[PDB]
Design a binder for these strands. Sequence first.
DNA 1: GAATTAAGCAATTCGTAATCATGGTCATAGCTCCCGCG
DNA 2: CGCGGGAGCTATGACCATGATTACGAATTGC
Lengths: 437, 57, 69, 57, 65, 218, 1006
Amino acid sequence: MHHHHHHGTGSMTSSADLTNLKELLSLYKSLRFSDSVAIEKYNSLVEWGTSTYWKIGVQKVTNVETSISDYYDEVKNKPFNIDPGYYIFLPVYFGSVFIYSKGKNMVELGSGNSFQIPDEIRSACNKVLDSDNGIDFLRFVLLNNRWIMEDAISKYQSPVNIFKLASEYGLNIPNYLEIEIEEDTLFDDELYSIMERSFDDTFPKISISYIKLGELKRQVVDFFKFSFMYIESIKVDRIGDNIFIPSVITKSGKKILVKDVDHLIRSKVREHTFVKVKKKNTFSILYDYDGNGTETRGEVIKRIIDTIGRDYYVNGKYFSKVGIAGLKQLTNKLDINECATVDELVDEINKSGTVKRKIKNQSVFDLSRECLGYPEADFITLVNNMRFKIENCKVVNFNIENTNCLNNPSIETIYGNFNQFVSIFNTVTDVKKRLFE
Amino acid sequence: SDLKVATDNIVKDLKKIITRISAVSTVLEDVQAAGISRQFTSMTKAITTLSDLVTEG
Amino acid sequence: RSDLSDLKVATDNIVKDLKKIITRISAVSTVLEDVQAAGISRQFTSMTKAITTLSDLVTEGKSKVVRKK
Amino acid sequence: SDLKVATDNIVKDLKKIITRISAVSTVLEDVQAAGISRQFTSMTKAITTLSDLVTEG
Amino acid sequence: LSDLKVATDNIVKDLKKIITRISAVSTVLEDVQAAGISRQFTSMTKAITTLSDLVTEGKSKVVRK
Amino acid sequence: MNSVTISHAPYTITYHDDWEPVMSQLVEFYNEVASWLLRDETSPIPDKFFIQLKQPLRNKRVCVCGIDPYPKDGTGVPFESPNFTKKSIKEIASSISRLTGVIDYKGYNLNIIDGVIPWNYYLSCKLGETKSHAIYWDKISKLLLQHITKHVSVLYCLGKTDFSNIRAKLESPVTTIVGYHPAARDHQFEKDRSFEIINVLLELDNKTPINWAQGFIY
Amino acid sequence: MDVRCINWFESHGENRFLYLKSRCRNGETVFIRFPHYFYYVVTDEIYQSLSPPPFNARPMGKMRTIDIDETISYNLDIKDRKCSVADMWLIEEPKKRSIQNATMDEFFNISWFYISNGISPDGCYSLDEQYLTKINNGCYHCDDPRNCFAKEIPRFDIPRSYLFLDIECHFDKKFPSVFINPISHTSYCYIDLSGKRLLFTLINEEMLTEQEIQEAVDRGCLRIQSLMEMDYERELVLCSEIVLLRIAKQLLELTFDYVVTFNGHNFDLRYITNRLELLTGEKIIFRSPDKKEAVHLCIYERNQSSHKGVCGMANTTFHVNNNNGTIFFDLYSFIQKSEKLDSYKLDSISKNAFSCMGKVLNRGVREMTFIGDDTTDAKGKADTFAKVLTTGNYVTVDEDIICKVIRKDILENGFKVVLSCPTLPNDIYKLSFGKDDIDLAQMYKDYNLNIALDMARYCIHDACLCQYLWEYYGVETKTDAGAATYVLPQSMVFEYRASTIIKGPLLKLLLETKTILVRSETKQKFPYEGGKVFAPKQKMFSNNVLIFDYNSLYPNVCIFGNLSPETLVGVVVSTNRLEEEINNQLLLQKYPPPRYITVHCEPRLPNLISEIAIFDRSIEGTIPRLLRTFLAERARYKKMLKQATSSTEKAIYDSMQYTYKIVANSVYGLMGFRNSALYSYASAKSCTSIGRRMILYLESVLNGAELSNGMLRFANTLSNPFYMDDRDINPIVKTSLPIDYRFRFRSVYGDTDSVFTEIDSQDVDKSIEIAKELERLINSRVLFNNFKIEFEAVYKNLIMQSKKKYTTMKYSASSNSKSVPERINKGTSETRRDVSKFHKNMIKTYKTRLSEMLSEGRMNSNQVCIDILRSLETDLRSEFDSRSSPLELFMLSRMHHSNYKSADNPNMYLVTEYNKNNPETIELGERYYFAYICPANVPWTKKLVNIKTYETIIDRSFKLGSNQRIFYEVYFKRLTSEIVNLLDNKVLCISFFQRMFGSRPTFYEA
DNA sequence: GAATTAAGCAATTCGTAATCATGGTCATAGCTCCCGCG
DNA sequence: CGCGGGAGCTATGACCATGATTACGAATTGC
Ligand SMILES: Cc1cn([C@H]2CC[C@@H](COP(=O)(O)OP(=O)(O)OP(=O)(O)O)O2)c(=O)[nH]c1=O
Ligand SMILES: [Mg+2]
C-alpha cells in the first residue's frame, strides 16, 4: 500500500550495490580467464543485477571457452624481422598451460577446470597475487608435475620484477634474456638455437615469447617443421612417488615427449603407426591434435593400458601404479617421518599440529583416496557401483554390485587395488578414532 | 589356378596397403582422407561388380 | 617406416598403389567376363570366399577414415 | 586353364572382327580409316608390351 | 546399311573393349608373375604369333591409300 | 527536426526525428487532456512543456528521470535552474562534486551532458504543487518514457515513492535505477552513490561512461 | 467501555499514530489512537550498549536465539545449532532506528503492537477509560495499550455501515475518458448505522434534454440543484454532473465501515475523483479521526512482482489513500485473488456466483415463467437468487441465452421470475445473472429518458450486486477471521499473500515458545522433488474407484517429522556409497529413531548420492506449531461448514477452510521458497520425501489388498516406513463387515496424498460402506500419529486422460446409490481456462458419445473411431463453413503479466499493443479474452505456423469484422488432438490428423 | 520523501525455436577416352 | 609414335530446403 510503496524496491543505490556491480564488471572482463567458481560468482552477480535493475548489459554464461588469446596473436612459423627496442624474452614450455587468475585457482586452458595444486605452490601463488593486484593471471606450465611460473601477464606493471619476487616465494622460474636489440635482426634458426641455449634450461622449451616494454599483447614465436616418423612402442617414465609420464618411442630410438595422458588419448596413437609431430633442434614435441581413429576414447584407453601394463591407470595427467599400500605410503602422503606402527603414527601426528589440522579438515575417504593416488571421479564411479559391509567404520567385506564400470581400465585397476585401499582406509579410520576420540 | 594365386597376391598386397592405411590414417588431413575415402568407395564398387559377376555368372 | 615429412606425397604414393590394385581387379573382372563368356564350367566357392574376406578387409580398412566430425 | 581359353575366346572374337572389317572394307573413307589405324597402333603397342612381358621371363 | 556411320561407330566401340581386355591380360600376367609361381607360356607364345600374323594382315588391309 | 500542430496553448510541438514513433499518440493524448490541463497555472509555461523533445535520443544512453518539474520556476528542462536555487539540482551538483572533485562551480545542468537526457515523468504540475498534473500526464508520461527507454541504456529515476512502479509503467526491460530523491530526509541522497552505479552499468552494456563533470556551470 | 474492533489503520503523516476504528453496543463509532512505534528486538547487551536510550523498552524474557542456517555435513560430527539464550528487549521508538544485530525484524510494527499488547484485531474489549484521553468527539488516545486492552469480552453484534456504489459513464468510444466523457449514472446502496438500506441512483441531467428532465420529474424522479436538496430516500434523483460529483464526494467522505465497489478503485472512484477535480476542482478529503491530518483520494497502484522466473511484475491492485478508517474494498481484486475463473468482469462473477436451477410453471410465446425454491436447487440457492433478482434485470438461461425480466416476485423460500425467453422444452433450467443483451455505446448514442432509466436500473443492479457479492463471498466473516488468525488490520487481511499473513501467528508462537530464528549465511536454492504422482493404470474404469486422501498431508508431515528450520539437526550428504553406509550406521546408532527422524532425500547436488536430514522431535518446532494453529482454524471452519444449512453459508465456510488449508500448504511452501524468512530447504525437501513415503506406504497396503470372510488383508505389512513403532504391523486386520463380502482392492492412481483404490464392485452403497471401513481401519492400524485419511468419494466411470487429468462421477461419502452424482472434471479441457467454450462443449458431447459407444459394447473400437472421426469431420466442416457458433464460444482467456524471460514475448507484446491502440487498458494480473482471428478469405490452413500472431484480444466492444473470421483451425487442432488421445486406432487418427492439419498428432504414453 | 513483498513441485498441453534426419542439388575432383599436332 | 587440350561422364563432398524431434518457456491445474 502507500505505507509500503507501489512496488517493493530494494536499496539498489548503496555502496554495496556499486561494489557488487564493479565486481561484476571485473569478472565480466575476465570471463575467458577465470575458474568455475568465479564464473558462478559472475552468474550470481548477473542474477542479482537482473533482479536489482530491470536489465543489465551482461548475461549469464553456461559454458566459456577458456582461452588467453586476447594477450596473444597468430604464431608464425616463418622467420621475420624484429623492431628495435628493449625486449623481455620468455621461454614457452611443453607442459599443459594453466592460468592463476583473480579467481584464486589454477585454471586449465581449453577446459576451464580448476586443478588441485600443492599447498606450498598455492601459498606462493597467493603471496604473488596479494603482493600486487594489477595482475590478470599467472601463466603456469604443468610438465612432469613441476609447476613453473612461465608468465605473469599484468595490465599496469612491467613483468620483470614479479618474476624474482615469485622465485623468492619458492615458485619455479625460468631464466631471462633482457637484451636491447636496438636494430633490425632476422630470427634465423641458428639465432633461435643460440637463444634456446642462452635460456640454459634442460626443461623442454618449445617456443619463445617476447614482451615489449611500451606495448601490450605480446607475441609467441615458434620455428619447427612438421614430421611423421614411425612409432615402435609407448613406455612410461617415473616422475614421482606413484605417477608416470607417457613417452612414445620411435623405431630409431628418439623419445617424443607427450604432454599428458589426455594428450596421449587425444592423438589416438597406437604402436606401429605414424604421428603428427613437431620437430625441434633439441628435443621432440608431439603436436596437439584430435586423432582420426574409428575407436572411441574408452577403447583407446583400453589399448593404452593393455600396452603399457595392466597395473597402470589414468590418474589425471599421469599414469599411477598399483603396489602394496602400507604405513609408508600414508606417511609419504602426510609428509611426515616414516612410521611402522599405528601408535608411532598417531604420536607423530600428535607432534605436528599442521598435519593434525589437515587431518581434521579433510575426511577419511579423501585421505585414503589421496594416499593411494586415485583420481576423484573414477574412484567415486567405482565406489558408487560397489557394496560394503561396515563394522565400526571399517570395511570388513566389499563386493561390486554393477560390473559395467569395470569396462573402464582405470576403474578395474583401482578395483584390483581396492584391498590396499581398504587397508589404508581402516588405518586412517583408526588414526581418527585414536587422535580425536 | 592362375586366378587363385593372382587373387592371393592381391590379398597380400592389399594387406600391405591396409596396414599402411592403419599406420597413417590417424594423422591424415581432411582433403587427403576425403581422397582415400573416394578410393575406398571405388574399391567397394569394383569388388561388388566382381561379386555380381561371380554370383550371376 | 623410418622418418617422413610432408605426408601428402606418401598419401599420393599409396593412392597410386590403390590405382594399381584397382586396375588389377578391373583386369581380373574383365578377364573373368571373357572366361565366363567362353562357356567353360567353373566352381567359384573358394573364389566367393576370397572376395568375401577381401571385402571384409576393405571394410575394415575403410572404417577408420570414413567420417569426419 | 583359364587364360588360354580366355585368349582363345579373344582371338575368336578378333577373327569375327577381322572378317567383318574385311567385309565392310570395300570403302572406308579417310578420317575413320585414320582413326581405326591409330587405334590399331595403340593396340599393337599394347601387344608389344605384352610380348615384352611374356619374353622377359 | 547406309552411310557406314553405325558400322564405323560399333567397330571403334568394340576396339576399346578389345584393348581393355588386352591390357587386362597384361595386368593379370604381371600379377601371376609377381605372385612367384612358375608358369610356361609356349602355347601363349604360339597364340601371340598367330594373332600378330593375322593382325598385320589386318594392317595390310586397313590402309586407305 | 519536425513539428506538429496541437489545438491547445502550446499550439505546436517541435520535436527531434527520434521522437517520431510516439508523436501522433502524444498529439491525441495532449489534445484530450490539455483543455483541462491548461486551466491551472502550470509550473513551466505551456510553450516549454516539450523542450526535451527537441533533444535527440540516439546519442542518449542515460535517462535522468524526475517525477515532475519544480513546483515553481520550472524552465521546461528538468533539473535546470538559472538562479540555481532549486534544492534537487543543488544536491545533484553536490553528489557530482563529491564524485569528480569539481567544487568550484556556479551551477549544474543535466541537459548539457553528452549521453544524458534529463527527464520529467509528468511534464508539468500546478504552481506550488507536486504531482498535481499526474492526472493529465499519465498516458503521455508512459508513452514518452517507454520511447526513451527504447533508446537509452540506463534509466535513472529520482524518487523511491514516485518510481517504485516504474517497472510497471514501462514494459520493455531497461536498466532501471530507482534512486532516492535529492530532497529525501535523513540524507539518503548524501549516501546515494548512483552516478557511479550509472557509469558501471554503462560499462556493463559496453557503453561510454557519462562524464558527469560536463554538467557543471562555471 | 465495550467496543468491537472494526478496522486498524495508521496515520499518513510523519507523526506516526496508530488508530482503531471501533463500535460500541449502542452503535456509536469510537476511535482509539495509539502511539505507533518502530519495534526492535535486541539482546540485553545490545540494549544496555545503546548510546541513545530507547523511548520504551519492555523485557521479553529469556528467549533462545537459533541460527537457522542449513549446512550440509559429510560426516556425523554435526556441530550443535547455535542457540544463544538471552534476555531480549522490545525496543520502541517513534522514529525508525537502525540497530546493529537487532533480531526479529521480519515482523511488522502493527503485529508487534497486537501481540506484545495482547490485542486481537478481531476482538471485543472493555476499554479501561483511565488510559483513554479524549481528543475530540468520538476519538480517544490510548498511551498504554497493555492495561486498556486487558478485558477481552465475548463478541457482540454491531451495526456496520456500508456504501456499495457503481457508476456509469458516457462513452462514444469503447471506453470512457474522464477528460471528455461525463458520468451518466452514480448508483449507491447506502446502509446507515441504523440498518436502513437505501438504494438511489443519481442521473446526470446534463446528458438529458430539459423536456426529458421535466418528464422524469412528472414520472417521479427528483430534480435537485445542490447537495442540500439531495434526499437519499428518493430512489431516482436527477442532478447535474457537478452536483452528482459533490454527492459522491459527500458519500465517500463519510466514515463508513466499508465502501465496496467492483473494479471501482481502478475505474469508478478514480473516475469520480478525476471528474470532481476537473469539473469543480474539489477533492474527496479523508480526515483523520483526531482531525490532525487530511488526505485526498488518490488511487495508487500496488504492483506485485512474481516470485518465480525473472520475478517480473505479475499483478497490480488499486487502493484508496484514505485515513478515516473506512475499508475501501474493491471486490474485483478480492475475487481476482480468491477465485479461479475465466473472466473477472462483474457479469462473469455474477454468472458464476448467482446461479440457481429453476423449473417452469408457465410457458408463453415470448415469456417464460420460472420458479425456484429449496426443491429445485440446494437450500439457499434460490434465496440468494431472489436477493439478486430484487434489483436484477437480465437472467441468463443455460449460460447461452439472455432473457429480460418482465415481472419479478420474491417468495418466502425462493423467487418467481418471468423471462423474455423463447419456448424451451425441458422442465428445469439453470438461471444465472450473466452477460447483458444490451450495447451500452449504442444506448449512449441515442440517449433518451427511457434509456437513462434503464441504465439507472442496470447501475443500481451493479451497485447492489456489489452487496450481493459481498454477502455471497462472506467478506465479513473472512475479514474477521483474517484479523483474528493472521493478526492483521481488517483492511490489510486480503491484500497480502502468504508470507505476511504467516508473520502474525508465527510472531505469536515465537513469543510464546521463547524462540528466535536468525540467519547468518546466504540462503541457497536447489531444485527438490515434490509429490509422487503415479501413472493411471487404466484409461477407462468400469469399476468403482475409492478415493483416499490424507487429511492435510504436508502439514501433518511437518508436525510428524517436526520439520522446522531450527529442529533440523543437520543434513548428512555422501558422495560415495562407502561414506553413505558408514554415515548410515553411525546415523542409526547416534540418533535414536523415536526422538530423531532421519529423512532420506534425493541429493541437492549431482556429486552427492545420498542426503539425509535429521530432525529433532523432542522440542516442537515453530513450523509444526504454526501448522497446528492453521489446522485448528481449518478444523473449526470445517466444523462450521458441516453445521451450515444455507448454500451461501456453506460456500463461505468451504472457502474459509480451503483458505486455511492453502495457508497451511503455504507454511509448507515458504520453506521451499528461498526469499522467505522460514526458508528451510531440508524441511520442505524432507516434507516431500516423507509425503512420498506416505503415498508409497498407502499404495503398498492398498494395492493388492483383498477382503475375505470379513478379514482385511493388505499386500504388505503395516510397518512404519521410517522406524519401528509400538503399534501392530500385522496386515490381517479384523473388520466390522459381513463374512459374505469378498472384494479385491487395487491402487490405480496416486497424486501426492490421494490414492485411487479400484474396488471390483460396482454398487455405490456397498463401496461407500466398505470404503468407510477401509478409512477407519487405515486410520486405526495402517496410519500413525497425526496421519489420517478420509474417504471422500466413489469414482464411478472414472475416465482418466493422463496424470492429473481425469473425469468422473462423484459419489461422496454422505451420498448413496439413489443420490445424484456430480460430474468432477480435474484438469481436463472443461476446467482449463486456455480452452474455449466451443472446445469444452464438443469435448463434453463427444465424451458422452464415446461413453454411449463403450456402454453399448456391440461394435468394435475401430468402427467407433471411424464413426467418431467422421462425425468430428462433419461438425468441424459445418462450423468452418456455416460459422453459426459466435465469437463467445471461441474466447480463450489468459492473465496479463510481465514475468517473462523473453522481453519480446508474444503475449506481453499483444497486451501492450492493445494498451497502445485502445482506451481500455489491461492491467497486470488482469485476465483478458483473446481469440485467434484471421482474415475471412483465408481457407482451411493445413500447416499451422505463426499461431500467436493471429491472437486478437477480445473485449466487450469487439465485433468480428466482415473481413475477419475466427481462425478455426487452431481450436479444431486442439479439439481433434484431445479426441485422438481419447480414442484407440492410432494409425487412423494420424491419417485423419494429417489430412486435416498436416501434422503428426501427439499421443500420451501410459 | 521513505516506507519491503514474495508458498512449493508435478505434470500436461501448446506454440516457438534450435537441432537433426532425409533428400535434392550444385560445384568439383577424378577420369577416361577422343581429337589433334609435332 | 607420343603427349597435351578438351569434353562427356561419374561419383562425391558440401550446401541448402523441408519436415520431424526435442528443449524450452508459458499457461494451467492438480496437488
Ligand atoms: C492444494 C495444495 C496442496 N499442496 C500440497 C500440500 C499437501 C499436498 C496434498 O494436498 P491436498 O489438497 O490433496 O489435500 P490436503 O490439503 O493435504 O488435505 P485435505 O484433504 O484438504 O484435508 O499437496 C500445496 O502445496 N499447495 C496447494 O495449493
Ligand atoms: Mg489431502
